[PDB]
Amino acid sequence: AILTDRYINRGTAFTMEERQKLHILGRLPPVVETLEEQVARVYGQVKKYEKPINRYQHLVSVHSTNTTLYYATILAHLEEMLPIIYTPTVGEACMEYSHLFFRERGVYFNRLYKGQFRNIMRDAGYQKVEVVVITDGSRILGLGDLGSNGIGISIGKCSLYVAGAGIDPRLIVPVILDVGTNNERYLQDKDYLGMREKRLGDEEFYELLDEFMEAASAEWPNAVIQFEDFSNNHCFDIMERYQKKYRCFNDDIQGTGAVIAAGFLNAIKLSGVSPLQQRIVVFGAGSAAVGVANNIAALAARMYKFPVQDLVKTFYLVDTKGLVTTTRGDQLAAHKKLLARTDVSAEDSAKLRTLEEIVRFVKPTTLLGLGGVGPAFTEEIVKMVMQNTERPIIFPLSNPTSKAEVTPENAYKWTNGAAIVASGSPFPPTTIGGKTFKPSQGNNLYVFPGVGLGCALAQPTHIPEELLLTASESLNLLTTEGDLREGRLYPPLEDIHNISANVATDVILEAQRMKIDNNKKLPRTRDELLAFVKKAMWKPVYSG
Amino acid sequence: AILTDRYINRGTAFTMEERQKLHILGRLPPVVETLEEQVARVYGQVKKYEKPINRYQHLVSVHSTNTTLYYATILAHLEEMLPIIYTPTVGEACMEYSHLFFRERGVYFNRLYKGQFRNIMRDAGYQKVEVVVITDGSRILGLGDLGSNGIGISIGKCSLYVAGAGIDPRLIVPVILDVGTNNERYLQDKDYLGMREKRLGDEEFYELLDEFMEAASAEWPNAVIQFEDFSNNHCFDIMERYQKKYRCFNDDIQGTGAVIAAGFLNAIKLSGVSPLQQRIVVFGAGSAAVGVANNIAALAARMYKFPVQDLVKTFYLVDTKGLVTTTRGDQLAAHKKLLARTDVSAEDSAKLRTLEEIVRFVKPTTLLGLGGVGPAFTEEIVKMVMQNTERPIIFPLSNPTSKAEVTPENAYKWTNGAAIVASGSPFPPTTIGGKTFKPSQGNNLYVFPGVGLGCALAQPTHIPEELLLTASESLNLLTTEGDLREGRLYPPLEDIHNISANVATDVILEAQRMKIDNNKKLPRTRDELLAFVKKAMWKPVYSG
Numbered sequence A, B: 001a002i003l004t005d006r007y008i009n010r011g012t013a014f015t016m017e018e019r020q021k022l023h024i025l026g027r028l029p030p031v032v033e034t035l036e037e038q039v040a041r042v043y044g045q046v047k048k049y050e051k052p053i054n055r056y057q058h059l060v061s062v063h064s065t066n067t068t069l070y071y072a073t074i075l076a077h078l079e080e081m082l083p084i085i086y087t088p089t090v091g092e093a094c095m096e097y098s099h100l101f102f103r104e105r106g107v108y109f110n111r112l113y114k115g116q117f118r119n120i121m122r123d124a125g126y127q128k129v130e131v132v133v134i135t136d137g138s139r140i141l142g143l144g145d146l147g148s149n150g151i152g153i154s155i156g157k158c159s160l161y162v163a164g165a166g167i168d169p170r171l172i173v174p175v176i177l178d179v180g181t182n183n184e185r186y187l188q189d190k191d192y193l194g195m196r197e198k199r200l201g202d203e204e205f206y207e208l209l210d211e212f213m214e215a216a217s218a219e220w221p222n223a224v225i226q227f228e229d230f231s232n233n234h235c236f237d238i239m240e241r242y243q244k245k246y247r248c249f250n251d252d253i254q255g256t257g258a259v260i261a262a263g264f265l266n267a268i269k270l271s272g273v274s275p276l277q278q279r280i281v282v283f284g285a286g287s288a289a290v291g292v293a294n295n296i297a298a299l300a301a302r303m304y305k306f307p308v309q310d311l312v313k314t315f316y317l318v319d320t321k322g323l324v325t326t327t328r329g330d331q332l333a334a335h336k337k338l339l340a341r342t343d344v345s346a347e348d349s350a351k352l353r354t355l356e357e358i359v360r361f362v363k364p365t366t367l368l369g370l371g372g373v374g375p376a377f378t379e380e381i382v383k384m385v386m387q388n389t390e391r392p393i394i395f396p397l398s399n400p401t402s403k404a405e406v407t408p409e410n411a412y413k414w415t416n417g418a419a420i421v422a423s424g425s426p427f428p429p430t431t432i433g434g435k436t437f438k439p440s441q442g443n444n445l446y447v448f449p450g451v452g453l454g455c456a457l458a459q460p461t462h463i464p465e466e467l468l469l470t471a472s473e474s475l476n477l478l479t480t481e482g483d484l485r486e487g488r489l490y491p492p493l494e495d496i497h498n499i500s501a502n503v504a505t506d507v508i509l510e511a512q513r514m515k516i517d518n519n520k521k522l523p524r525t526r527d528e529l530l531a532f533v534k535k536a537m538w539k540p541v542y543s544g
């Protein structure tokens, strides 16, 4: 009952006296270790494997045997483990090694179980669920439809709430809504265990997802519902359909913009060039890219009370046709109209098509890379931004490292260390003339865990944009005057518990201000509330 | 309680109606599979890995989740899985990947627990244990001292009793007696979890092993104790110390000789050249090699009632100095004296040192490779044996494939298909002139499971040499006139359950004849007893 229960198993951390008392003497090799020693040992076992997928496979066996030791190991080595336990290793494990998720506790829905969703949730036998991560395996980036195998994405995401914000590992639920797959290999694969049919149309999709939201609201009323890795045809419409009626958010949309805005406003503080003096090229004009721009504007308005109209005029949106302007002659998509230049002539628009000529005309102080079309921030373009500011802000956020607009190394080299860089991936430091530079990674881990922990404690009726904006500001303000002097845009990733507790505290205070909080037990003053939030967090230490 | 219990979990083999009844609908992806389908799926998952160690790692995760599916997969693919789940992959997993055994149910003894062995066995909480495999990690071949990590050897060996003879997986216990290690890397390794000291001397070794045998005899009175992978300094002395007093055997010593004798007498039947006409070079003169020779003699005496003295005179023993003779001038080790030629002059002995000149003088009809010194059965030597018999019997039994005296391919090539070959490793078939040849593999799996199953049912007071000799004869007689016409020396490995049931039946009848059997419930006639033994075997099928 002790060794075989992964939540209370301590393995070699059981003392000789504990082993005798628990009648497990001789069930373990004789060495007694501390958790710190067990972590160092597990870290050596992980590094004995060269390939990410094999490191993940090892970590899965640790999680299945000693859950405290698993989470202890992730927190000791967070920056290094992140690429293994989530993007991009987790999607590779879903696509080709889906058996790595068979043993994990999750919930599988499909059309065959229509009208039974509530019964299936009841039967799962959870207590006071706090977080539910749901995907359909469609993929936000629309690469590698995973179908049913998308369960691995929900499982990996749930583990980041536990590690990042101390969501108790028993109070989190990974969910796959299998509405089919358009993955041709899977549709023909004898070993695919999911619904063997093309993805359902919107009407049936929403019937099943409505039943899921309603069942969850009734059976898991304390839960936050987080949408993960839904395709663009659904992810925005899902939030529009449910944001007011259920306690839900989408990390890809709302988390990404909260994190990027926080980093960007710290880049502005370091740059010299204040927010109304910034001239920002937004390379890429999808709904997501425009969402990030709007989140930057909203955050600058909150922190500084500049008129938002004036902040929107700092943005120069570039789509596949060129600079988005009112004089260009095309009918603009709704999301592009708000950021469209009104101050550029038809004749100038005609000559603003390539990024090099747009940069030469706009004279930007910032390049935001949200383009997903490879390395567009060329040496020539970086050299022109150096004419417009002493401290170019360059954010190559497109993933992976090959789709990225520019390497941090190149940005630092070409600017001789002047570039302020945030990345969507970890990069090693660059040294120029004995001076060391390292990009700030805008990882989504900075925001979703603290939103999850704040929404779990506060029990708000719903998650309005105010709570994401509060989380974005909280994150910005956690970057210390010391961190800022060393060129960091974010508090350090390894301090994620403190980050999450602060973000959670600020989200709770906002829910309290709006009177949407249903938990009347919580402190209503920041210092006392922060102390309370920290004590509520589950910690990967042996407890009893 | 259902999915999380590896003994009753069926995974996708639970029907839709079962999943609803058991309240696990939505705990599994929706496809329902038969066990045969699950086996094909697992077999594909195993072959997705290139390296043996990675295939083993996958099979460990299947065993931890669905034990019935694990054993079903091994039995469907036995010949292919054998090298992965035991020798030589298992020793590599012990040496460098010992974490693969952490989750497995075993028992760890050492000097720190002196006087507690019985309490530790009681606490392990087993019912009516049938088989116990114990090692100290010293290694029969004295390569790669594993210390505590030798637990993996006992675990792999126990799984071969379950797969080979349907020992119920709940009624088998893997044991490590950690009496230290002489592995210098381990003694310095911060992550070694065993007793960090050089191996104990003989007096303390036997104090601890005596306590083990006595504790086991009292707490697990129905068990057979099998010694596995003990070093030569102890393995023979252990059997001398315990064979009469406890229900125990050593598979390396007693199993190997039983299997090789059975194959060799079938090679003699195929050869034309009858046992008293055979002239057998025994290349290698260790205790083990001489044990095998004596087991061949004892089996030929039992099956054919030739005087054993006359069979012993068919053997020409070759040690590192040359042909073992009474006229050679050295003082012979006790085990070499029995097989020493008395019919070779001092002057002939002086000129009988190289294997090529011994073969030229002896004119053997058989070469037995038990030498462990690489490829000594050269083309020239094989060509000389062709002068002495139409059907040379060539047995390169030294492991691994590099220590082997000759490849089966070479033996078949050089003899143009006339060679009768048994190997200690699996080999692919060889085709010569459109005719296909494949060596017979003398795997230890043919004997120990059936001895374990016979001794579990019969509950003999002890395991005298009569029961091994009976098992050796049983195995020989299971090679059908059809198998023999196709050149096979052994019944087919994939029929291991039937083999084990027959071996077990013949062992029981022998224990009954000697009146050492303590189980009075068993049939005493072969047909009825075989039917009973088959029904008692655990089968990897879903039962309830």
Ligand SMILES: O=C(Nc1cccc(S(=O)(=O)Nc2ccc(OC(F)F)cc2)c1)c1cc(F)cc(F)c1
Binding pocket: A003, A004, A005, A009, A010, A011, A012, A013, A027, A028, A029, A038, A042, A058, A061, A062, A063, A065, A066, A069, B099, B100, B102, B103, B104, B105, B106
């Ligand atoms: O926990 C058990 N044994 C253990 C033996 C050495 C060490 C440890 S540990 O917990 O201190 N470290 C550890 C663990 C599992 C890792 O994952 C992958 F390697 F197995 C990796 C490290 C644990 C255990 C659990 C059972 F359910 C049954 C049982 F008989 C033993």
Ligand SMILES: O=C(Nc1cccc(S(=O)(=O)Nc2ccc(OC(F)F)cc2)c1)c1cc(F)cc(F)c1
Binding pocket: A099, A100, A102, A103, A104, A105, A106, B003, B004, B005, B009, B010, B011, B012, B013, B027, B028, B029, B038, B042, B058, B061, B062, B063, B065, B066, B069
């Ligand atoms: O058994 C479970 N799920 C399962 C899901 C798909 C398929 C199967 S299976 O049993 O039909 N096949 C299978 C299994 C484990 C393999 O090992 C390595 F891949 F996990 C390999 C194949 C089983 C299970 C067990 C739990 F303890 C909790 C839980 F939530 C689910």
